[model samples]
Each structure stands twice: as C-alpha cells, then as structure tokens.
Target chain A: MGMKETVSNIVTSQAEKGGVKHVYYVACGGSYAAFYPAKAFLEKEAKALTVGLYNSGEFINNPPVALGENAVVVVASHKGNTPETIKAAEIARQHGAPVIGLTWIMDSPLVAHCDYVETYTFGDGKDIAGEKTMKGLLSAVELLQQTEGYAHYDDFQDGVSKINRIVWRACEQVAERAQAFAQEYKDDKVIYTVASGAGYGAAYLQSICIFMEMQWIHSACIHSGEFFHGEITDANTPFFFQFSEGNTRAVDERALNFLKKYGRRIEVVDAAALGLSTIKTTVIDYFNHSLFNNVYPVYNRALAEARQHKVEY
Target chain B: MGMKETVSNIVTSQAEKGGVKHVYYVACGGSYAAFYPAKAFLEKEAKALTVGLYNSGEFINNPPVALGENAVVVVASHKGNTPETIKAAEIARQHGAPVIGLTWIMDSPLVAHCDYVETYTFGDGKDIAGEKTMKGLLSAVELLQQTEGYAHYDDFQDGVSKINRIVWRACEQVAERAQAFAQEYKDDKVIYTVASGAGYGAAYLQSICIFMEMQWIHSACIHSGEFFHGAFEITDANTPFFFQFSEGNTRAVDERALNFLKKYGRRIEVVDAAALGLSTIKTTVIDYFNHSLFNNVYPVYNRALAEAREY
Candidate 1:
C-alpha cells in the first residue's frame, strides 16, 4: 500500500480498537514541535481523547500503566534510530499499548517493533531529511480524521491537503522572519522570547535552540504571564518579544503594555500578520466574523515594525 | 576541667591514636565556612594525609571505597545532628576508619555514633548561633596542639590559650575590614575577591560568604592565577578586583602586576597588621622560630587597611 493508505489504515484500526479514548504522541528534539499542532487539532476534534508527551521523559519517570489496554501509543521518529524513541516503542509493546510508529525509513527499530508502521518517503524515495515534517503532518492528519469520525474519506483527505498547504506557507514565512530578526539583534547582549499556552512550548523550544545555534545569543524564553510576576520588574534594558497568535494575545498585549509603562525598550513580532490566518479564522469562526476587529491592528503594529527593520531570521 | 584543659586532652588523645594519618572533614552551608581553618590547618600539617569533601557529595557519590586500617576520619557538624554526617560516620565505621567527630553539642548523632567525640560547649551554650564561632576556636586550638606535638600536658594547655587569643583577634579584625569594604563598594556594580594557593581556600570560605550575606552584592571569589589567563582582558567597567594576602611574595607580586596592567579597580587586605603579634610569635616559636625570619609585607598591610577603614 502507498504511504497515504497505510496512514489511513493505522488511524482507522486505532479508532476501531478503542474509538480514541487516549492517544500519546511521542518524539524529541526538533521533532517535538510537531506535537504543538497535533495537540491543538486533537483538542478541537476529539477534545479529551488526546495527550502529547516527550518520548525521553516517558521512558524515565512514568511507565505505561493504562496504555495497551485502552490507549494507542503513536511514536514519531525522523531518524528512526534515536535510542530513547526505539526503547519507548519496545516498552509500550511490553505494556500492551498497541503501537503505531511513524517514520520516513521503512526499515528501522521503531518500524520493526511496532504493531503498525507508516513511512513517508519524500524526494528520491530514499529517506534521509525532511522526514520530521512529514511524520508530524501525517500523524496529526490521520489522528484527527480517525477520532473525529469525518463525514467521508474524501472530505477528510481534502482537509488534510488544506492543512499541508497552510503549514508549508507558515514555515516559509516564519523562516523569513526568523532570519531577519537574527540579523537585527546580532549585537544584543541578551534576548528573550515570550509566548503563552500552546505557543509557550514552541517559544521555549525555538528560542533556546535556534537563538543559541543561529545567533550565539544567550536567550531566555519565558511564559508571558509569569514575566510580570517578578522577572520583568527589574529588567531595565530593552528586550525582544515574539507574540504567538490566538489565545496568546491577552498575555502578549500585557507584555507590550509593560514595556510602555516602564519606558523600557522592546521589539515585538505580531504573529497574526505573519501568515497565522488560522488564528484569525478561528476567532471569526467562533465569534460570527466581526469585520470591525480592533485587536488585529495592535498586533499589526509589530508586523509593520518588523518590515521596517527588514528582519527575516 | 577548664576550656583550655578540655581542648588539650582531646588533642592529646587524637595525637596518641596514630596521629591522624588521613583525615576527612565534611560539612555544608554555613558550617562549611566555620570549619575552614580546621581544614586548612589539617591540610598544611597532614600534607597529603588529609582530604576535605562536602557532606552532600560524599554521601551521594564517590564515598570512601576502603579505609586504611590506620585511617582517621574527622567529621565536623557544629550542631552534631546533620543526617548525612551521621550516615558518613556509619559508612566510615563499616570501612574500618576510626571516626572522630568535633561538634558544639553533646548527645547529638555524631557524638553518639563516632569512636571519639569532642564538644565545645561555650558562648551561651546555644546549638545554633554562638556554636559557629566557638566550634571553630575549639577545633583550631585542639588541632594545633596535636600537629605541633606538645612536650607536656601543661605546655599543650598553654598552646590552647595562645591559639584562642589569636583566633579571637583575627575574627574581630576580619569583621571590621569586611564592614568597611562593604561600605566603600556600596555603589559599585560588581565586586571580586582574588587569591591563590592557601589564600584561595580562605577567599572561598570567608570572603565570599560574608560579602554575599552582609551586602547583598554579587561577588566572584576567583583564583589569582586565573586572572592573568583571560579574565584580566575583560577588566572593563563591569569588573572590580579585591586581593587576599599570603606569605608568598612572588605569587602576590605577580597578582599585583596583573591588577596594575589591567587597571582594574582593586582593594587589598594584608594579614600581618590584623594578626596578633603574640599569636604570630607563638606560631613562630612552634616552628622553632623560623617563620619570623621569613618576611612578607601583605599581613601587615592587611592590618593597616583594616585599621584605616575601622572595619
């Protein structure tokens, strides 16, 4: 079977077995960011039926207690040979959690050990790079369709296509913005990134790893709400801020207000204008499409500044 | 028995038990600083025969694999009830190392469990506050007499009294100097205390703790040799330097030169001026009067600065 059919079958089987009572999505390092969208989509569709955990942490502290009996353990590995990820899949098998391993490589420890496996072979049909994005996209799409009980398979396939398009566009925009920001802040002594809720996890992972690797800057990623609690009161110098779109706005707005109040320096990145149309769509979808949206303008100020500064990092 | 006699007897007993072939001192937090002199005295006298390890690290990992049949473990717990120290004493006993516990309280765990126990029950007899100072004084006097090889019981008693007077005077001078230095650097962004060899141990123990607690200023106690390596190059507006005194003039002058070259802000505290002349004379006599001929000006300079600052 093709990669698409294999993914669909895995999702359908998991749904048939337990009807998606609980699903644990596991990965680590950069691949871990894939869980952000998976978590967000799962909540919207299945509501209480999904949970995401890092594979490394799962292997250490908490062993699978209620997994194989009623839940599905979905493992996403890009290299397909991370020791900890392979170990977790083996442990899940021992504990009776019917495992589904997703990777780009067809022959891997993860693929060999699991009950079901899905391979996303891209480019020259030799699995090497860009596998993390494929595994993330496929796993999230399949899990959503399986648990949500779509009207038809064609409708579900269409939705998956839409999500793929959105993600591709979002990545391109974020890459451009990120490169520009790195160049602008090349001489800063310290840089800080702030986000809230689901965005917080992305903020922490991206800020710590990317800033350290790309710019060689000491960057601390903080929760937007906690900044005002104590961390920000003493920070007299100007700092940079990245406002994640959607529910992150409340805390992000407060952070902007804080910079204004203390007369401190800051460079704000508004998430909305940076191709986060889903966030705006969700708000309009939920609240009856209000055209007189004043909230979007405040965030646009940050986008305008970014454009003026020519930041693309 | 009086305090002097009590200390002498403990030292005499410790000396008789094969003279502390290898001694290990374990402590944490404030007790770590209070026990610094004992660690220094033991290291100097015992040379390769003594090792000091923090209680937390010792208990958790790198524990004593096997104690030599003649090995001695000297554990310091001012309150005598630190749980890890007690466990360490048990572990030492299992490994056949004779344990000697020095504390300020009687009937505490270390006292009850060790092969030998020395208690300093002075200064309000409180376990928490005064014991920190009193225990240091007792430990120093006792250790000095043992290492010096007292000729007679009466001579040992006399030695104890002399050491007590010296330590008391030194503490007073240090307290005064630290206070004045604290006031001088009230507006400074950062303060650093630098030392080498023997002085590095003291800088880590006394100066870092005192400055951090009293002034709420961030201070880095760095090794003198390290300053020349790369830290000297970064002696910009953010860094301030303070120097600790020692008898080694060569090392001291090298450090001074580095400070001068960098044009780093500096403060120096000499040991001689603050150290009591009588105590200095006594130490010299114990060394058969050889240390008197070895002149280094840093101690006298330290005392002068302390006096000038009224610290």
Candidate 2:
C-alpha cells in the first residue's frame, strides 16, 4: 500500500477507538535523527495534537506522563533490533498507546510490539514514501490531515509521488560533489556536519551514521542557529554544511557564509540546486528530510569508498 | 523584591488577565543554555503550560506561531545587550506576549522591551533564587504552583533558600578535582562534555560558555543517551571526557555512557551530583538545580585552566 493508504488505515482505525491527543516519535541513531523533520512538521501543522521526540533510552527512563491511551508512538530501528527502541515499543504498548513500528528488517522482534508495522526500501530511493524517514514523515502528514485537517495535504501528496525521482536524479547530480568531498577530505581526522531546522537531521545522520559509525571518522553535528552561539570552531576545521532551502534557511546561510570565509575545507550540499523547489513552495521544506536521507548519504558513501572503508557491521 | 515575590506577582497578574498557555525561554550561549533546567522542570511540573526553549536567533527568525497573548517569554542575555535576545524580547511584546527579561546589567537596552525585568548576581551564587537560572526556575515553580499547584512547592522553597550554600560548598568540594582537570588536560585541543537530563544544560554551559568561548578550545556537548548511537565512536584513550552525572530519572543513561567511556576513555573527569551531596535538596526538584550547581562549580576548573594555559 502507498503511505497515504497505510496512514489512512491506521489513523481511521485509531479514530474509531478514540482521538490521539499526542504523538511521540522514538528511536536511536539515524532512526532517532530522522524524526527531526517529522516533529518539526507536526509541531507546525498539528493543532489538536501535542508532539514529543525522544532518544529511546531517555524515553524509556523518563517516559512522559502523557504517554497513554490518548497517545500514539511511532518507533523505528533500521534492523528492527535496537534494545532501547524495542523496550520503548513494549512500554508504549503497556501504557495503552498504540505503536507504529518502521524498520527495514520486516520480521524482526519489533514486529510483535507494534500495533502497525511498516518496512521501507533502505537506500534504494525506489519506493514512494517508502524510505524510513519518508514513511515517518508521510505518517505524520496523514495524521495531521485526518485529525485536524492539514492545509497543504494535496500538495504534500503531489510532492510525495515525485520524491523518489527527485532524490534519484539528485543522487547522480550530487555524485561529483560527493566524490570530490571524498578525494579532498579523505585524510581529515574530524569532519563536522552543519545545518539547522529540518535539515539538521541530515547533518546528524551524516555525522554519526556515516562518518563516525561507518567510516570510523570523528564528527559532531552542529545546529546553525547554535553555531554562532557557541559551536564556532577554528578556521582550519573541516565542515560539511547542508545548505537547506527551508524557512530555517537564513540561519543555515548565515553559518555557511562564516564557514565559507574562514574555513579551509568545506563541503556544501544545497537543496535548491538538487531540485527541492520542484515541489510546491508550501510543502517543499518538509521534503528536505527525505532528500537528506537519499542525497546526503551519497557524499558520505563516496568518502567511505575513498577511504577503502567497508561500511558494515 | 524577592524572585518568589516577583514571580508570584507576574503569575497572579497574568492569571487575572488570562491563564498563560505556553512559556518560551530564549537567549544565547550560557544564557540560552541556562533555560534547559527551567524547560525540563516546566515540562515535568507544569500541567497547564507548554514549554519551548530556543536560541535567540532561531526564536527570532522562525518564531513559533503560538507566540502571542497566551504565551510568556522569559529572555536572558547576561550583559543585557545580545541583539538577538533583545530582539526576541521586542518580538514577544509585539505579539501581545509578556516579556520577562533576565540579565546582569541593570541599566541596558534590553529593559525597554521587557514587561518585567530582573537582574541577578553573576557567578556569586549569593542570592536565594537570585542567580539567573534559579530566578528562571523559581519563576517556573511559582507559575506552576499558582496555576496548577505543584505538589513539591514548599520543598522547592526550602531547596531555593539553601541553594546558595549548597553551590558554595560544592564549589569548594569539587576544587581539587577541578584543579586536577586544569593540570591534566590543559594541553588537550578538544574536550567533550557528556551528560543527559537536566544536567545536559550544564554540559552545554561548560562546553560553549567555558571551553569554547573563554578557553578558545574546541568542545562539543554530547547527550549521554545519544552517545551509544554515534558519539561513542569518537571515544578513544587520548580523548578527554567530562562526564556529568545527573540526579534524575535519566541518570541511568548517563551511567551507561560513563561505563562505555570507562572502557576506552583514559582521561575522564567526572562531576557527579551524588558525590556533590545534591540529595540535600528536595529530591523531586533536585534535578532542575543540577545546572545551577554545575554553573557555579565548573568555573573553579575554568579559572585554574585559564591560569595553567597562561591565557
């Protein structure tokens, strides 16, 4: 089923039981980082529902008081086997909050705890609203539309259908920049990822999932808004800035200008150049999460390929 | 007027007009970081008010749609002169929201944008709920009690009355360890602050306010729960780790991060709330005070660090 239909089934069924007053998005690492856009979307779009995002461990240790019958938790783990996320799923269910599990490992242990389970193609960009992050985003979009009625629901649907091609073309389009990033910064010890707002998740994913865990390089994701506040570094520091085309673009551009002036090695992946504007202006910003999920990894994988580092467990 | 009185007046007045539905805590750097505890406390305690914490720039550039008459913005800039924060105060007022400005300088431009202006001692820890963070905390506590009747209201009062002494004693107690940090890691280029829960604010405060801004060293504050996911990969024997242990439900996650660090991190500096005798404060609200204690305590280390580095 398409994500629209999948979300409709879940939301309509849940509506029959009772209203969902709150939604909690829980996971770890890339999965946890991916929810940034979803939370930003729901926060801006959902009038009737409160939103909470948490690292699964913290969610388990300090579960919100609002996590009960009136709440629904969307939990993800790529392999469907992170213990903290699994425990979070059980806890959410124990509290009578329905669980919607998103993962790549279809029949993993996470399947048992979830009221609804979704599996998306990993790194293929073939599925429409079928990647982990896009699935989560579409779920949120549909939830808002079903509950309080989202203003740009039709535009969002039109955007989702084209996301796969948008990302696929951008992957090839950005491959040169990605490969160049590898050739230049392959020997660098620390590579920090910089962005703000919805695109911050891409910075986060590239920092931890690709650079740190996959390539064995040290990295930290810096929020552009907070960059001027404190995360400013020396002129020689290596940075990969994700210049986002969103409402939060000003802060990202502000940070970009600074890094461009002072930094020696800087890699930029801009959203507009990648054709994110092809989507409706009203809903374009919401698609950056999926764009990052698809496009940013190209740059990181190219870096890994250059280092001769096999990205695997 | 005492912060308790000041907050009580604000809460009562706002109540008479219409109950506050949301509270935004905004500023930059240490001032921005100081609101973490207030946000956490309000999140857990305030049954009626929603909480938002933001860097002054983000708050200005992409202001929340909910920022209007039903909201109150508590903005801080230590010097009363951060343009972003002052602009945040002005924006809040423009939206018909009341602005409570916190700063050290009594006479400054930030006062013009504020409905209620407050000043606190900078690093003295002498005021009873008169430090910037504590002032924010007391305001939150008072607002909660007046609006929804927080169960630990009087215990919070008792805790506030002794906060200055508790922090002062902790400053002395942690001095030797602080001094050792300065001696041992004075030459290190990068330092990472590890923490979770309300103490994460302290981790953030120390990283930017002390290490990055003041010491000119590269530092990043990593959330403990986030460490296992990706940050742990950065850990090694040569790297220096400052692990901040919290006295909250999330302490387990902090301990988990510390255990991982112990295996690989040889140069580890730990600032634990239990060792600092934070239990003397009311347990229910003690987590919220961790940032204040850390704010006052870590300066001892930074002072020694500056001297050792000859900066």
Candidate 3:
C-alpha cells in the first residue's frame, strides 16, 4: 500500500482500539521546527490529544514520563542518521509508544526503530520537511475528527495536492521585496522577528534556524502577543513582522501598530498582502503562510552570497 | 497569616483532596522561564504529575484543554498587571483548575481571578521575579512530595527570615567571578548560554532576561543535551559556554558539554562550581541556587551590560 495510506490505516486502527492519547512530534533542529505546525494544530484543534515536543537528545537524556502504550511519537530526521533521533526511537519503543518515523532515505538506520516509515522530499528546504510531517499527522488528526464528531477533516485534500503551486508562487513573489529587506536589515546588529498563530512556528524557524543557526546572525523570535509582556520596552529595535490571515491577525496587528511609532526599520510580510488570499481554505492558507512566512530568507540568501556566506556558513 | 504559611496551607489542603493530576506553569518571558526548574523537577522526581508550560498569550489565546478539575494552573506576573497573565488566570479558574497567582502587587487586578495570591518583591531583578514565582510553586511541589510520602518540609520553616541572607551570601560569592567574567566578555557581540537539569531554566532566564532582554545583547540558551543536536556546528574559539550544576541526574549532561567546550580552548563559564552556598543538602541547593547566583547576574551583569552598552 501507499505510504500515506499506510499511515492512515495504522493511525485509524490505533484510534479504533481507543488506545491513543498522546502525540509527540520528536526531532531536532530543522526537523524539530518542522513539527511545530503539527503540534500547534493539535494544541488548538484538539487540545485533548495531549501533544509533547522533544529535542532528540533531551528526550533520551530523560525519557519523557508521557511515553507509554497510548502515545504515538512522530520522529523526523532529514539525513535519516541523526544518532539521538535513532536513540529516541529505541527508547520510545521500550516505553511502548508507537513511532511513525519520517526520513528522505529508505535505507536508513532509523527504520529499524520505527513501526511505520514515510519517505518524502523537502523540495522547499526544511519547510518541505514540515509539510511532509504535517500531512502524515493530518491523517491522524482526521481520525480524531471522524471518531470525535469534529468537522475539521473536510475539504482540505485539494490544498495538499496543490501545495507546490502556492509555495513556489508565493516564494517567487516575495523575492524582490525579500531582497530589498535582506539588504536593508542584514547589517543590523540584532533583528527581532515576530508572528503568531499558524505562522508563529515559521517565525520561530526563521529566527532560530534561518537567522540564528544558518546565518549566525543575531535574531530573536517573539510571539506577537508575548511581545508586549516585557520586551515591549525594546520597541525601538528593528522588527520584521510575519503574519497570516487567520485568528491571530489581531495579535500581530496590535504589536505592529503599537511598535510603529517607536520602532525603527520595520518590515512586514503578510500572507494576504502577497495574494495568498486566492487560496480559499483556512487550513490551506495557514499552511501556505507556514511556508511563505519566512520566505524572505531566500533573498537574504542572495544578499549572503553577495557578501560572504553560502546556504549556511 | 504569613504568605509562605498560607501557600503551604492552601497547597496541602488541595493535595488532601487528591484531585490534581497535572500542573500548568503558566506565564510569559522571565516568569515562564522561572517554572522550568519545577517542571524539570516534576519530570524527574514526580513523573505522575504531568507538567505543561504556556506563554501567557498562548495560554489565553486558547486555554489548555488539559486544564480541568484535576489540574492546577500556576500563573505568575511580576508586576501583577500583565493583561495576558491575568486573562490566563481567569481562564484557568473558569476551567475548574485552581489558579495560583504570584506577583509583587497584592491589590492588583490579578488577585481578583486568583484562587490564591502570593505577593513578592523582585529586588533581584528578573531572577527575583523568577524566584518569587518559583518559591510559590515550590510550596505546591512540596505538597505533592508530602502527599507522596517524602519528608522535605523540615528546615525551611523560617523561609522568609533566611531568604535574603542566603540570596545575599550566594550573590557575594558569585560577585568576584561574575564581575571578572563579565569584564572579560562584556564586549563580545553575541553570547550563547547552555544549561541542563534544574539549571536549564536558570540558563534560559539568564540568556533571555539578563543578556538579551535587559541588556539588549544577543543570546541563545541551548540545552546541553539538545546542544549537540545542531548548534554544535558553530562552536569554536569564540563560543561562550554557561553551565550550571544541579542535583538533577541530568546535570551531568550539561557538564559533558562544558568539558567538551573546555577542551577546545573555547571560552567557558560554569556556575555550579563557584561554591555559592553553604547548604550541605544538595537538594535544597538545587531548589534555591539558580535564584541566588543569577539573581546576582542582574546586578553585576548589569555592570557588563552597561559597559558593553557603552558602545
């Protein structure tokens, strides 16, 4: 059977047995960032699902108390050979949590520790990894919906099939503005990136992976709502606001408006402003912003090449 | 009634009812960072208690479904006026989770939504806010421990009387090295802080509040266990490693990264070995230690932050 079908069957069977209660999106670095959207979705869409995220080493350092017969751990490693990722799979098995492992390479060491495996490619960098994992988890989410009398499982399969058209179109459109943004902001000593809701995970990935890890540039990712808590004192710092058209637009708008007068060098990349409104499904739009939220990094890549870095370092 | 005694009474009474199965450490920024130790504590010491942390906005945005009659939502806002924090407390109360609120303002709006309020002063700056929230939560933890039949409530009865003395002592001890360390590295543009075990929470507080938030310096806090996962790629001559020791067995995980950093001729700062307190019982030290040393990180690191900001 097909990989998605296999995942659907196993998860559906697990749900029918009434044994699944916990979901773990376990990975590290880029892979970990990839799972944030799925975890966030479970958190809002199905809070009873009990989601936990762990970096592989930390998971192995102290095996999660939540791991047991009723838990499902979804692990991802791009190379398929991250040692801690492999070790975590082993520990999850020992604790009786069923593991669904995702990787690009089929002949991977990780396969041994996994109960189910899905092979996928990240055609859009690490976010492609996120989409792959999200799709797999989405099938499980559909199970929860069907069994629990929730209607979230409706009308989104078309969004999945047309994913690349949205991501690429959105990516190309953002290129010029992103280039100008990269040029304008690259020299700033420290940059703060802000977002909320469906795109906050992307904001975190951008701030940590793209800005901090990949470029070695100093960046802080703050939730737009959390922005006002204490860091609001530093409103004068340069900020890049990332927002999608969803329930959290107000949260971002609050910060964006409040920071406007005091903050300098403010740049914005909103999903609706980029013509992403054409995608009618709310979940699809959310996922599109998930891909397009930090699309500015591509232009930053060009600027990095012009200056002194490539891909990363 | 004294605040500490009141907290102890309320927590114990709740424990006697035997209904709380989960603890939610809910807050934003430094306050949220404060709960990490207790969360880490529950994970290692009491696995039966499921612990969840939420940023105040996230908490208020969609209240945790985990919150219920069987859950306790521990909320902290240093000033007691943070709107989201107050909202989270209200939401938790609505969900039947008893709200434990920590703040400096006793008459503030937060007290209205709180099932129990513990007032405290953040004289230690951000770490003090952390410590205040932490102290309130510790009472609840001790309740869980006492209920689970572990005896730890003996020596700390004079908690308020000895609080300042122990904090000052630890502060003075870390001063010389903290000052020296601050001086040597104040000019460094970007700093990376690492910690694991109980101190991982402290490491986060330091990296965010002291270095980044208060100082406007760029900082990243990495878990030692999680560090080797990806961030190890950037470590070299210029890397600054901050490690703290705790009674948590996972403390060894951080020390492992520390030794690795040391062997590379990279810059390193280790907090646990500084001999900050005279307490013999390692467990007491682990519980209160982060609040003391980095409680001092504010004052002396302020010196570094000021000089560095002199740019």
Candidate 4:
C-alpha cells in the first residue's frame, strides 16, 4: 500500500488498542541514525506526542518505562534481521506498543513481530523519497497529517516529490568536489564529522557506518550545537562540516566559521548549495536526512575506491 | 542554606505559581557533564516530569517550546560566570521558568538570574557531597522527594552522607594505580574513554576537560552502549582506552564492552565501580552517584598523566 495507508493503519490500530502518546525510534548503526530526523520532526510538530531515539540494544535492555499501549515503536533495520533489532520489536510488542517496522525486506524476521511494516526502495533506487531515511520521515509526516493535521501537509508532499530530482542533481553537481575530498583525506588517521539539528544524523551515519566501520578509520560525529561547549579540535584534525539549511542552521554556520578560521583541513557539504532551496522553507529541515543519505555515501564510496577498500554491491 | 532547603525553595516557589512538568539541565563543559546523573535520576524516577539536558548554547539558540512557568531550569557553572550559562539562566527567567543556579560563587552574574541559588564547597576543603556534582544530584533528589515523595529517600540521603568518605577513600586507594596508569600510557597521542549510563558523564568530563583541554591529548568519550554499533573497531594497541564501570542497569552494558575490550584492547585502564566502594551504597541510588565518585577519582589518573607529561 501507500505511505498514507500504512501510517493510517498503524495509527488506527494503535488508537483502537489505546492511543499514541510516545513514539520510540529503535534501530542500530546507520539504521539508528536514520530515525533521528523523524524523531526531530515529530518532537517539533506533534502537539502532545513525545519522541525517543535509541540504539536497539539499549532499547531492549534498559527500555523506557513509558513503553505500553500508548507507545508507538518505529523499529528500522535495513535487512530486518539484526538480532537486537528483532528482539527490540518483540519487546515493544510484549509491552503492548504497536511496532511499525521500516526495512527493505518484508519477509525478514522483524516482520513477524511488527504490527505494521513499510518497505522503502532498496539499493540503487531512483526514488530517494522512498528510501528508508525518507520513508522513515514520510511515516512521521503521515502520522502528523493523519492524526493532528499538519499545516504545510501539501508543501511537505510537494517537497518530497521534488526531493529525488534535487538529490540526484546535487550528486551530479558535487561529484568532482567529492572526488577531490577523497584524494585529500583518504589516508587520514582520524576524521571527525560535524553537523547540527536534523543534519546531525547524516554526520553520525558517516562517522559510524562509512568512516569507522567501512573505511576502518577512527572518527566521531560532533554536534555543531555542542561543539562550542566541548570537543574543540586542533588545527591538524580532519573535519567534514555539514551545513544545514534549517532553523538550527545558525549553529552550523557558527561552527563552520570557527573551523575555517582555526582548522586547516575541512570539507563542507552545505544543504543550500546542494539545491535544498527547491524544497519548501516550511519543511526544508525535515528533508536533511533524505538529501544527505543520498549524497554522503557517494563521498565515502569515492574514498573507499581511492584507498582500495572494496565494499560489496 | 543547605542543599535541602535551597531545592525546597525552588520547588515550593515554582509549585505556588504552577506545578512542575519539565526540568532542563543547562550548562557547558564539565558542568554540562555533571548534570547527567541528575537528568538520569529524574528520567528513571520521576514518572510525570520530563527531563532535558542541553549545552547552554543550544538551550539558548533553539530553546525548547515547553519552557514556561511549569519548567524548572538547572543551570550550573563552576565559577557562576560562564557567559552562555548566564545567558541561559536569563533566558529561563525570561521564559517565566524558575531557574536554580548551581555554582561555586554566589556573588557572580549567574546568581542574579536564578530563582534559587545553591553554592557548593570549592577547592581544597573535603566535602565531596557538598561539591557541585553531589549538590546538583541532591537538588534532584529533594525535588523528587518533595514532589513525588521518593520511596528510597532515606537510602539516598544515607548514601549521600557516606559518599564523601567513600569518594575520598577511593581516590587515595586508586592513587598508586592511577599513577601507574599515567606511567603506562602518558604519551599516547589519542585516548578514548568508554562508559555507559550515568558513568558516561565522567568519561565525557575526562575526555573534554582533563585529557584534551588540560593535557593536549586528543580524546573522545564513547558510550559503551553504542560502542558495538561502531567504535569497537577503533580499538588497538596504540589507542589507550579508559573504561568506567557503573552500578545499574547499564552496568551489564559496560561489562559487555569490557569483555570485548579485554581481549582486543591494549593499554586499557579500568575504573570499576565495585572497586571504588560504590557497591556499598544503595543499589537503587548508586547509579545516581557514579558521576560524583568517578568525576573526583578519575582526575587522579588524569592529573598524574599531566604530571608525567609535564603539562
């Protein structure tokens, strides 16, 4: 079915059971990072609904006490077979929460425990909006629209329809610079990724999945909002600063100015420059995950090739 | 006034205007790290009240919409003069939320914005429970007690009364081992501190405040709960690891990280909670004081490292 139907079914079923009061984002690795934008989206927009983002292991072991009939758990796994992710879904179900699983495979083990499942476009898909990141966000958008009625519902849908083209065009625009970024920083001992607000998740995904796990380079994702408080870098540190085009963009902008002044090695992936302006201002921030999910992996894949690290297709 | 009366005033005043619905832990650097215990405490214990922990900058730039008369903002700064923290306090006041300032200096600028100020003992005097970390926690305990009436009130207070001696004794006992740790890994270019739950804040404090800011060593605090998700592979012989073991639900999580690190990890420095007499405290409230113990004790190791490196 469509995104609207999947979300409507979950809300309708969950509401029948009790009512949705809290939403938990449970996953791991890049999957865990993917839910950040959705969590951020629902937190700001939903009037009465509370949101939580957690690693699946943490979600299961030290689960929130609020998980019950009123809780809606959105558990995302790429393959739907991550052991912890599966267990988390089961635990959520046992707690009487309506578990909505977002994944690539509907037949995977996680599907059995889920109350509803939304499968997005898998690898190498043209539909950026149907990818897990956007699908995750689309689920949140539909939830708000169906339950409380979002003001810019039409604008959000308009932005999502336009996002695939914008994301594809952005990849075309930044290919040369991305290749140069790989050549310059491929051999660095440590790489730190920085971003704030909705854009922070992309940096987090890059740090964990791409830089550390894939490329075997030590890395950390720094929150631009918290960078001034601590995690100050030296002049020699390699940084990938992500500039957001959102409400929290000011924090990212401030961090960028500081990095430029003090740091010698810095690569920037800016949302405004990457054609996010085409997305409506009303919902531009919410599109950060979708845009960066498509854009960031390409840079690392370039770095992987440069460094002779072969990743499977 | 003592921690009890000071917290009482803030809660009582805020209650008179409107009941508390949310509490924000706002500060920067080590002060920001210190509140993790209190935030964790309230998050687990206080059923009705929501909790927020933010750097003073983020607290100001993109303030939470829920900040109103029903919000209680706990803004902490050691000297009471951190510009962003003072601004955060002022913002909290402007939002009509009662601001409770935890600081060393009563006469400083942050005091002016606070609805109720609690001054803790600073420098060489021996009052571990009266320090900022404990005072911050005691305030939370009092808030919970006065409002929801905590079942483990006597146990929490009993733990606090004995915390100073336990913390002081732990420091003395660990001094030799800490010095040995410095000797072993003094010149490492990069150090990573690993911890989970309330103990995670101590690792954060050690990373930003002691290792990086003071000793010029590059460091990052890895949450033990999230380590397996990515950072476990960053471990090697060249990279020194400082692991903090806590006493709570997250202790098992920390132990899971420890089990893996023991085999693959080299130059590992362990700060086990059991070794520090934290096990003697009430299990229900021990996690709340993990930051207080580790924040005070781990500095011996970092200080020794600084001394060895001649920083």
Residue A173 in candidate 3, Cα distance off native in Å:
2.0
Candidates 2 and 4 compared by DockQ, better number: 2
Accuracy of chain B in candidate 3 (TM-score): 0.81
What is the per-residue lDDT of model 3 for residues B1-311, given as tens digits with 9 covering 90 to 100? Answer: 34446545555656655656677888877777777666655554443455677777766765545577767778888778888888899888888778888887888888899988776556533333235645754655564564453344443333333545555666667667766776767676556777665556666666665554345444566667655455552444454655565433455566666677777777776676335552443444244445444545445654655565500
Candidate 4 overall lDDT versus native: 0.77
Q: Candidate 3 - CAPRI tier?
A: acceptable
lDDT of 1 at A253: 77
Clashing pairs in 3: none
Roughly what TM-score does model 4 have, to 2 decimal places? 0.90
- Report the Cα lDDT for residue B88, model 4: 95
User: Which regions of candidate 4 fall more than 4 Å away from where they truly are?
Assistant: A1-18, A139-155, A213-217, A231-235, A310-313, B1-18, B142-149, B213-217, B234-237
Q: In order, what is each prediction's RMSD in angstroms? A: 20.9, 3.2, 5.2, 3.4
Tens-place lDDT per residue, model 1, A1-313, is 1234655565566665655455567665444554554554443334224344443332322342345544667776665876656777887778666777777677876788788886554432323112344355445555555556533335434433344444344445555545555556544444555555444444544443333333323234554654432233242334556565554465567767876787766666555554445533332111100110112223233333544531101
Query: At residue B99, what lDDT does model 1 achieve?
Result: 67
Candidate 1 chain A: minimum summed lDDT over ten consecutive residues — where?
A: A284-293
Question: Model 1 residue B292 lDDT?
Answer: 18
Global lDDT of each model?
0.46, 0.76, 0.62, 0.77
Q: Is candidate 1 or candidate 4 better by lDDT?
A: 4
Candidate 3 lDDT, A23-52, residue by residue in tens: 777787667766666666665555345666
